[PDB]
């Protein structure tokens, strides 16, 4: 369980020690980072051989529709699983595990199953999708590896649960939302790509401080299969700087001193704002990296 | 009058009234009384009348769960009312913190009742040889808090022990010349007063003399005579005048000490002995 954000997997050419990293209900709560364990740190788990978190949970084993479920536990005055924190998600998972059975979850949509949302009305916070060529109808499911599984929900499972409880800073970005498959010198092509568009348009440099949180903030809108983040540091002049002529201010490292020299890397930005540097050997990487990507 | 009325909790800063659900308590959704009802029952005891589920703190582990428990068990349960607030078991305050109540023992929370100034605690707790009722009680397999009406007594019954199913003794739902009904002078004063009725008053010998030949009344019983007061003589429940009096030319009828306080007729003769009423004897209040 290593989320490829925190952790440089390449050609590997003073002890390391991992650990298990909280973010404060972040929707990728249970990172795994590595430091040097000289350090003191806590540990609380030790393996050998409804209320939850202020909220209330109802299960029932019958085998009924979306509709006819909702109905059903609704008398009680309850309404159906909607997802919004990693812990919740984590109990309903462990629940349905403990149960044996892919039990119902609720939502609905309104226009061909392209704007998801809950019946609680909160903003998107969470995504835990699990692929992008199941998306056949306008309802989700939760599987036993703890993913959302799309499918139509107008059958019988074997149960259901249900509770209780742009302009900015005198900039203008842009998304970009195409299929492109050019896999070769990715460093002397933006520059022109970005200024056919409209004169004075140059790639996006960090130059402030609240941008990073602004461009984080409007991140998590379409993340469905969108979950690394890139920019714009390459091979510069023989060291790690932008594409245009000028100097590095805002320093955009890990840890230590970076000697990359290849060509190119992936400089990426973590879910808080963790620096992170990645030298790839494969270019099988690039998905993530023009087509569904912050351009 | 005097009695035990249903009621709903609130909280004065927030909105927010208690709302019970299967096991817990559940936010507002308030100002309808069609579900959300409370009253005080004996031992101190919280009672919701619908779904006759009372709660209670269980301390067994870190952090002590306020759940729903069931009335005959031993759970503990039993709560209290500090100058603006409430504390159960030990010092433990109801915290709300927004939908749910826990007991953290915190001392800034307020609760009051629906739509007045009140600490919901001014009202004290009011209520087979006419003993007075256990309020809750299990009978077919359901709680019940108030004395109902059926097709099997005249009127309105109730039991007379904690246990009914065990014991099986009933009683009438007293709401007079109650024979065969030995109860405390005191006791039969607050019961009356809870009746919001007051003691037998006797101004005129045409009463007393009515009373001489009634058949359906004891030979021994209280009339109220006695001194609430310790700085006057004799006095009634009321306020009547004292003007006729029928006492006892036997006893020396010693003042305070020697004798007693209290005052006991006897209708076969028709005297009044002085007397300590703290034992059960019939009574009659008008």
């Not at chain 1, 520059?191 to 984080?216: A, G, M, Y």
């Not at chain 2, 009547?240 to 076969?268: H, Q, V, Y």
Request: charged residues 20%.
């Amino acid at each position: 369980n290593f989320h490829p954000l925190l952790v440089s997997g390449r050609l590997r050419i003073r002890y390391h020690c991992a650990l298990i990293l909280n973010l404060q209900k972040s929707p990728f709560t249970g990172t795994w980072n590595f430091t040097s364990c000289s350090e003191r740190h806590f540990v609380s788990l030790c393996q050998k051989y409804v209320k939850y978190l202020n909220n209330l949970y109802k299960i029932i084993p019958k085998t009924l529709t979306w509709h006819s479920a909702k109905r059903e536990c609704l008398k009680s005055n309850m309404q159906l699983v909607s997802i919004t924190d990693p812990y919740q998600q984590a109990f309903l998972s462990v629940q349905a595990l403990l149960h044996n059975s892919s039990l119902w979850i609720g939502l609905f949509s309104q226009d061909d199953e392209l704007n998801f949302g809950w019946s609680d009305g909160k903003r998107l916070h969470f995504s835990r999708w699990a692929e992008t060529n199941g998306q056949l109808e306008d309802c989700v499911v939760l599987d036993t590896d703890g993913f959302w599984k799309t499918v139509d929900c107008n059958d019988n499972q074997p149960g259901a649960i249900c509770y209780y409880s742009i302009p900015f800073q005198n900039c203008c970005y842009n998304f970009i939302i195409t299929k492109n498959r050019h896999m070769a010198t990715t460093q002397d092509e933006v520059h022109t790509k970005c200024q056919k568009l409209n004169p004075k348009s140059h790639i996006l440099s960090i130059r402030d401080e609240k941008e990073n949180n602004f461009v984080l903030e409007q991140l998590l809108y379409f993340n469905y299969m969108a979950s690394w983040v890139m920019l714009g540091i390459t091979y510069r002049n023989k060291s790690l700087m932008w594409f245009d002529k000028t100097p590095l201010s805002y320093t955009h490292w890990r840890a230590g001193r970076p000697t990359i020299k290849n060509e190119k890397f992936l400089a990426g930005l973590s879910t808080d704002g963790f620096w992170d540097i990645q030298t790839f050997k494969v270019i099988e990487e690039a998905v993530y990296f023009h087509q569904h990507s912050i351009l | 009058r005097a009695a035990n009325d249903p009621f709903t909790i609130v909280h004065g800063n927030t909105g927010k009234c208690i709302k019970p659900v299967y096991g817990w308590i559940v936010a507002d959704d308030c100002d309808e009384t069609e579900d959300k009802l409370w009253k005080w029952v004996s031992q101190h005891r919280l009672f919701h009348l619908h779904s006759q589920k009372c709660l209670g703190l269980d301390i067994t582990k870190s952090v002590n769960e306020l759940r729903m428990f069931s009335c005959d068990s031993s759970a503990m349960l039993w709560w209290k009312c500090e100058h603006h607030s409430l504390y159960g078991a030990a010092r433990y305050r109801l915290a709300l913190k927004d939908g749910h109540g826990t007991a953290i023992s915190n001392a800034s929370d307020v609760w009051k009742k629906g739509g007045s100034e009140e600490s919901l605690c001014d009202q004290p707790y009011h209520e087979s040889y006419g003993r007075p009722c256990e309020f809750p009680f299990l009978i077919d397999g359901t709680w019940h808090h108030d004395c109902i009406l059926d097709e099997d007594h005249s009127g309105p019954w109730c039991a007379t022990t904690l246990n009914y199913e065990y014991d099986r003794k009933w009683g009438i739902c007293l709401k007079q010349f109650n024979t065969q009904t030995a109860l405390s002078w005191k006791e039969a004063y607050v019961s009356c007063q809870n009746q919001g009725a007051d003691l037998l008053s006797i101004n005129s010998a045409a009463e007393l003399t009515y009373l001489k030949e009634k058949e359906g009344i004891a030979k021994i019983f209280w009339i109220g005579l006695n001194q609430l007061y310790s700085a006057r003589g004799w006095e009634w429940s009321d306020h009547k005048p004292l003007n006729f009096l029928n006492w006892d030319p036997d006893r020396p009828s010693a003042p305070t000490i020697g004798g007693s306080s209290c005052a006991r007729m006897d209708a076969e003769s028709g005297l009044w002995q002085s007397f300590s009423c703290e034992a059960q004897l019939p009574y009659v209040c008008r």
